[PDB]
Structure formats: C-alpha cells, structure tokens
Design a protein around this ligand. Structure first.
Ligand SMILES: [Cl-]
Lengths: 226, 225
C-alpha cells in the first residue's frame, strides 16, 4: 500500500538465511533420507517453539534445534548419529545467506529505513550466522525471542520490536518466508510482505498480505524511496 | 502414584480415532503421494491449531482440518481437488477407531473409572466420529476445546477436564499418542500414558511419562482397579 514506513523488520531463518543448506551442504553424509530428515527437522523445531510457549516451558531456540535434530536422526534410524549431529548443528550455526540478502539489505539501509532482524533464535546462533555470512554489517538491529522467553507468533514479540525500534506497528514492513509468521505479524499490525520463492499456496487469509514477491531483490522496487 | 486414580482421559484424533485411515482408505484415488499428503495434512492441522491459539485467532477444528487439507492437496498439485476434498473430509468426519478402542474403553468404564475424551475436535465433528465408530456409548464425557476457544496444550484446556470431571490433576490418567499432548498434560499435572504404536523416539522429556505401551489393549493389564 502507501509508503511512509520507518522500518524493515526481517525474519531471519528461512528469509535471509537458507536453512535448506544445513542438510543440503551434508546430504551425502546423511544418505538418501536427507530431504525427509531436513523436512522433519524444520517441522519439529517449530513445533517445539509453539507448544513450549503454549505449555509455559520456554527453552532457547538452539536447544530446540538440537532436540529437534536428535529426534529426526533417531526417527530415521541413522548410523553415526553422533557425527551427523555435530556436522549438522555446525552447518546450522553457519547457514548461508540467500544470494540477494546482503545487497538488498544494503540498499534498504542506505535508503534511510531502520533495517532489523526479528527472529526466534537466541543471539548466539543468530550472531554466528550473521557473522559467517557477513550480514553483521548491513543491520541496524537484531532482536531475539530469547530476550522475552516467548516465541512467535505471540503478539508480545512483534510488540517488543516496536518497543525496541521505537516505531508504531504501521510504520513497520515485516518481511518473511513463513506464512504463520506473516499471519501473526499482520494480525498484530505490521505491513506484511511475503517472500515466496517456490510459489506455495496461500495460508492465514484472515491476516491478508500487503504484497507477495518471490525474491529478496524484489523488495527493492517495493520499498525504494523518492 | 499408581492407583488412587479416578479418571482416564483420552485424546481422540490419533489416539482412539485413526487419522491415517482417512487417506489410507482413499490412497488409490489420491495416488503415490498419499502418504506424503497424509503427513502434510496432519502437520498443518496441528500447526494451525497452535499458531492460531498463540496469535489469538481461534477457528474451530473442522475449519482447520479443511484449511490444512486444501493446503496439502494444492501443495501436491493434485487433480480433482474438489472431489478429492469431499472424499477426504467425509473420511475424516467418520474416522474409524483403532481395533481395540471400544473394548478397552468399555473395560475401563465398567472397572468403575470415569472415562472421558478431551479433544481439539469441535462437537459436530467429534460426535459424528464417535457415533460412526460406536465409541459414543462407552464414554462418560466428551470434552471439546471449542467450548473454550483455546487449543491444546495451553494449560486451561487440561484444567477444563479437571473442572468438568470434578477431579484433581493427580487423579487423572491421560492417554494419548502425541508427545506434545502428553507434554502439555504432563506439565499440567496429569499422570501420563503414551500409546506409542510404532516405537517413536522420545520427546518433551521434561514432562516424563508414567508408562508407555504399544497398544490400547495394553492399557487394560496396566489399569485394572
Ligand atoms: Cl496465549
């Protein structure tokens, strides 16, 4: 819609950092089960995030990641679970950026937006990954659920972003790949833009998107200022 | 604790009612992605229940079931989605019980236990499923998350069971096949028993189990009062 926004808030894992690369970078070691493992790891890490907040038993995102990975390795009865867990947690700690992430953030930063991350991950796994892909240098601020001990899409975390960044919901453009994160952010009040790389079908229709695009780079036409 | 229990509370979908059967009974019409499509439908049904309850946007279980099925079928670019959606919805409306559900419930009831379902399902879907599988008449109570507009495993749902059943947490035996549901109940105070049919690895360990069995019928040796 109309364009007087002070802030671009990014989800990290799956939006700017490519989680698929965790298992992809190590697919040969895993064996033919790699896709399925990858998929179960993602789904569980999120399950553990959502259920743990509903049952009032927070733990940090890294331990969730770890717990979820262990579960998935056992599910698939893999040899050398010890080795694979090491190899794969490490690969997670240093996920690669989508090819466009840095440049498009650079373009937004130098356009006068506050450019921030709002992620589930504790600062440690998050910092290591921003360091490794060098997105450290293209960010004003990086905000963690771990600061509140609460997971998305709980409205408190979107709230904490307004608080920390000193902006109102409607002065935020919230960019993410996860329909549930966009549904949660929108219901809260952010202008939501979905990065939909593969064209998956829509979900969370009650919190309609402001726009969908298929690439970080398309954000640039979407947001560039006079 | 072992035997000052007054109540067995069962999860429905996935514990007494078999959700595989919905797709499994239509596998041939669906094609080779059946088993994928089935998992995706289960994972999305639940995702919607948890994330909607987290963002304060409740819709009932039938709707979420519908949305998740639509999303799944689209994802697999399947053909004849319309007909495929009616077949699969109806299959879910009247899910068939596990082979042993009836007997073991009826044995538990008549051993003097209060015998209840506590489900995410709303009434219409739950009643249709309990009628069709004949599980209706062997239950003292059927308790639905849609009375609260809050899903498992927020504590208030398990609290609802206590309240309506007039028992305390430690007097309830909570039977389910879902680790997260067991997690939720465990943490809230129920005594937990997992029906782990396929031998899945553990999860939600901070809320340990009272017992695990691989079948509903193994619940009987264990709970004889
Ligand atoms: Cl809540």
């Amino acid at each position: 819609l109309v364009d007087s926004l002070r802030a671009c808030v990014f989800d990290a894992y799956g939006t700017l950092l490519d989680v698929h690369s965790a298992v992809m970078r190590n697919a040969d070691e895993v064996g033919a089960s790699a896709e399925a493992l990858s998929m179960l790891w993602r789904q569980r890490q999120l399950e553990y995030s959502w259920t743990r907040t509903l049952m009032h038993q927070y733990a940090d995102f890294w331990q969730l990641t770890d717990e979820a990975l262990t579960f998935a390795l056992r599910t698939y009865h893999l040899e050398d679970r010890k080795g694979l867990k090491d190899r794969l947690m490490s690969a997670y700690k240093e996920l690669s950026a989508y090819p466009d992430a840095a440049e498009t953030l650079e373009k937004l930063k130098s356009a006068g937006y506050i450019v921030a991350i709002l992620s589930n991950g504790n600062d440690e796994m998050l910092q290591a990954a921003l360091k490794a892909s060098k997105l450290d240098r293209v960010l004003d601020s990086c905000l963690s659920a771990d600061d509140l001990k609460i997971y998305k899409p709980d409205p408190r975390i979107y709230q904490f972003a307004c608080d920390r960044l000193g902006v109102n919901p409607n002065e935020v453009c919230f960019v993410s790949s996860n329909a549930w994160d966009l549904g949660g952010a929108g219901k809260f009040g952010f202008n939501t833009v979905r990065i939909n790389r593969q064209g998956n079908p829509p979900e969370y229709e009650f919190a309609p998107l402001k726009h969908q695009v298929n690439s970080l780079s398309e954000l640039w036409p979407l947001l560039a200022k006079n």
